[PDB]
From Swiss-Prot, chain B:
Homodimer. Interacts with BacO and BacP. In situ probably interacts with monomeric and dimeric ParA, in vitro interacts with ParA in the presence of ATP, and with ParA in E.coli. Residues 58-79 bind DNA. The chain holds residues 289 to 421 of 489 of the full protein. This is ParBC domain-containing protein. GO terms for molecular function: metal ion binding; nucleotide binding. Changing residue 62 to A: Loss of CTP-binding, located at cell pole, ParA is partially positioned, wild-type affinity for BacP. The keyword Metal-binding applies. The gene is padC. It is found in: Cytoplasm. Disruption phenotype: Mislocalization of ParA and of ParB, nucleoids are more compact, bactofilin patches are mislocalized. Synthetically lethal with smc or double scpAB deletions. It comes from the Bacteria. Transmembrane segments: none annotated. CTP binds at residues 23, 34, 39, 41-42, 59-62, 99.
Amino acid sequence: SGRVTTVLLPLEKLQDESAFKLRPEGDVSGLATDIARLGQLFPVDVRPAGEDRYQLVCGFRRVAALRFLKRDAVQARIHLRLSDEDALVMSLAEAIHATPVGPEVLEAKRDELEAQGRLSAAVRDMLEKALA
Amino acid sequence: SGRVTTVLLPLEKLQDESAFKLRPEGDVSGLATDIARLGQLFPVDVRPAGEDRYQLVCGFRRVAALRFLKRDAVQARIHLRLSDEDALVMSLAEAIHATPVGPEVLEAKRDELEAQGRLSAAVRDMLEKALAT
Ligand SMILES: Nc1ccn([C@@H]2O[C@H](COP(=O)(O)OP(=O)(O)OP(=O)(O)O)[C@@H](O)[C@H]2O)c(=O)n1
Ligand SMILES: Nc1ccn([C@@H]2O[C@H](COP(=O)(O)OP(=O)(O)OP(=O)(O)O)[C@@H](O)[C@H]2O)c(=O)n1
Ligand SMILES: [Mg+2]
Ligand SMILES: [Mg+2]
């Protein structure tokens, strides 16, 4: 039972518009380096725009990072029967309902990972560049 | 059919542990009200953790909210071949790399939707409460 399906979406099928974008992508070189390194960890959200084409609802920075890497596809969830109003609500939902993990929590986590012997070079790098 | 798959996962199939949790869930009242009204919009992330059981990697607040709705299940991505280190990385990924949308952006969106005649009462109320103190 599905209205949502996840696919490896060719970027040529994504409409070249940005109605649901909330903010400029900005510099995505750091996000792109992380995606080249680890893969794209979280799929973006799109809806059909007829014509075997799709409109981006969430994920502008991730898509911008994949274009920086000169990739031709993005992992995407396709939402069926997503109205204009419900796509607007979706585009805002992480912004409104996510609780950020503050730097105090990240520092305490780093210290605990160290006490546990779980601080790999790559995780140390990540946490310290975020805590800089 | 690759290395991740999405399921409606019974909550009783999560291990009773919190190895990858970063912070207390806190009051999930408002998140639960939103999920009751709109559905769970984004799936949580898990990995297999024994026979027919799973370990939560991302999504402790959504799981708490669903348990604060007395629901039987959570929408979940099951990650295969997710090592201990790669799960730690994934549990930190949104925290480190997600750029917040600040309230200045939310107010400017509220104002633009109004100016456009596109501001429904529902979205007005959502933006105004996010912009509440
Ligand atoms: N290797 C990585 C590193 C990060 N992420 C994800 O990239 C997202 C970046 O979040 P955000 O700053 O909100 O960017 P987008 O959602 O892509 O862009 P927008 O919010 O503007 O639509 C985070 O969810 C993070 O988990 C990812 O998919 N793969
Ligand atoms: N109706 C709603 C409203 C919110 N969300 C999601 O709930 C998540 C809340 O994020 P966060 O504060 O980080 O909580 P969790 O990820 O669930 O918990 P944790 O970060 O501690 O693992 C956001 O991604 C938001 O999009 C959702 O799925 N359905
Ligand atoms: Mg985002
Ligand atoms: Mg989270």
